[PDB]
Design a protein around this ligand. Structure first.
Ligand SMILES: N[C@@H]1CCCN(C(=O)CCC(F)(F)F)C1
Ligand SMILES: N[C@@H]1CCCN(C(=O)CCC(F)(F)F)C1
Length: 460
């Protein structure tokens, strides 16, 4: 029985509006409705992993697990295994996998983050799950961010708190937040970004939706505009949106958007918006392809419609050689030439690098770099040819070219990371000097760049 080099992953997000679901929700798991939808010829083909995020979920974990498992069994005739379930207040994540994957999955972690303070602490935040699937790390975040059209900055703050404080994946990756810990990271939920147009344009917006003309609405979507200005979700992807706004509907139909201010809304308008979203970030040069992104048309218990997204995702096997794991393979090495970090910091400490990778027995600390002043004000930290030679556990190019090196640049004075990034070893050539590059971030904001050259030696 061969190990897979690809899997498919279903991501669902649904704000259930504190109402039980209807008796049939299979269209959600089949990616049928509006947008980029899944071919009918695939309906019986189970996804490898289903990740379900709910918000305003009124059900117990038991109640929802029974609905989800029975739904997937009806679709696929497969009885899925429960990988993980985690609930904060009414925010929930469920991970289900095909039974054949049970002994491919390990290191399962769950966590939550509560956003806000006092007033604004009590119902928003995020839940997440991570695990290893053979050689590949997978992370999943379901967030319910702050509501309201005039709170985009609060949503951006909620995002930064979640990526700082959600404790998933390998704790040995201490300088790295969740935006660097996984081969593939999926972040979804009721992110609550709105279409920023004047209230008076409500009926115009509805018109446009009825005509399936989304371009003039998407150009005012706060998540797309905030992402363009690098205010949030830096270095994440989202498929093009080709489905109608998923909020705010009258319940029990999809024929009506309920946008007008009511006591029940705190006298706020809810112009039609794409509140419910799926984004991802994968390590450089790993296969990931969105195969569906859309909303259901036939699930109408909530004022939100469910959103689905599906992905092909590259995975690797749990590699064993005669040497590593348990030793190094002297036929492998990773060298760095002419490397330098460019940092936005105004500080003057010395810096050193840490290299982290599951291709190393443990992380590697460099010597301090040499600080110079850039011609436009910047700090340039030069490592020259001084960086340590990295000794991978396995030299086989079928393993090594699939790996990645995480880099942290740390202050000698405080040992605090000023920037984190990632380099792929999926090179065009071995035993050849090749350019490398990563942006550096800290708390998910841009702090600098790392560039230089790499020389990778494999057993071939
Ligand atoms: N093909 C690259 C993928 C990642 C960043 N890129 C964007 O165009 C981001 C646009 C926005 F505004 F949606 F963020 C380019
Ligand atoms: N532990 C690995 C499993 C698969 C391939 N391997 C061998 O064939 C080892 C041969 C010898 F001579 F070391 F025993 C190494």
């Amino acid at each position: 029985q061969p190990e897979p080099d690809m899997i498919t992953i279903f991501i669902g997000t649904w704000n259930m509006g504190n109402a039980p679901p209807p008796k049939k929700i299979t269209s959600w798991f089949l990616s049928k409705g509006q947008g980029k939808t899944r071919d009918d010829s695939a309906d019986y083909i189970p996804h490898d992993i289903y990740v379900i995020g709910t918000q305003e979920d009124p059900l117990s974990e038991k109640e929802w697990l029974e609905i989800l498992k029975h739904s997937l069994q009806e679709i696929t005739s497969v009885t899925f295994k429960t990988v993980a379930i985690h609930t904060l207040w009414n925010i929930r994540i469920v991970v289900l996998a095909k039974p054949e994957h049970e002994n491919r999955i390990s290191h399962i972690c769950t966590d939550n983050v509560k956003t806000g303070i006092a007033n604004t602490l009590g119902n928003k935040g995020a839940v997440g799950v991570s695990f290893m699937f053979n050689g590949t790390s997978l992370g999943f975040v379901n967030s319910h961010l702050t509501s309201g059209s005039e709170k985009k900055l609060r949503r951006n703050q909620n995002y930064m708190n979640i990526l700082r404080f959600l404790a998933l994946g390998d704790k040995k990756l201490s300088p790295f937040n969740i935006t660097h810990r996984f081969t593939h990271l999926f972040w979804f939920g009721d992110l609550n970004y709105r279409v920023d147009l004047p209230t008076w344009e409500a009926e115009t917006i509805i018109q446009k939706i009825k005509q399936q003309q989304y371009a003039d609405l998407l150009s005012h979507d706060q998540l797309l505009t905030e992402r363009r200005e690098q205010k949030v979700f830096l270095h994440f992807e989202e498929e093009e949106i080709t489905f109608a706004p998923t909020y705010r509907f009258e319940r029990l139909t999809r024929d009506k958007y309920a946008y007008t201010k009511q006591k029940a809304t705190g006298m706020k308008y809810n112009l039609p918006s794409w509140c419910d979203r799926v984004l991802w970030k994968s390590y450089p040069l790993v296969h990931v392809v969105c195969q569906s992104y859309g909303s259901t048309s036939d699930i109408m218990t909530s004022d939100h419609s469910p959103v689905f997204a599906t992905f092909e995702a590259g995975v690797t096997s749990q590699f064993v050689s005669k040497n590593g794991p348990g030793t190094v393979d002297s036929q492998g090495q990773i060298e760095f030439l002419r490397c330098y970090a460019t940092l936005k910091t105004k500080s003057q400490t010395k810096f050193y690098l840490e290299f982290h990778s599951s291709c190393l027995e443990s992380f590697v600390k460099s010597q301090e770099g040499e600080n110079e002043e850039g011609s436009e004000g910047e700090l340039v930290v030069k490592f020259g040819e001084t960086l340590p030679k990295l000794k991978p556990i396995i030299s086989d190019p079928e393993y090594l070219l699939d790996q990645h090196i995480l880099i942290s640049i740390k202050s000698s004075d405080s040992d605090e990371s000023y920037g984190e990034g990632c380099i792929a070893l999926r090179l065009e050539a071995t035993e050849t000097q090749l350019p490398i590059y990563t942006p550096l971030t800290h708390h998910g904001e841009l702090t600098g760049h790392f560039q230089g050259e790499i020389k990778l030696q494999t057993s071939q």
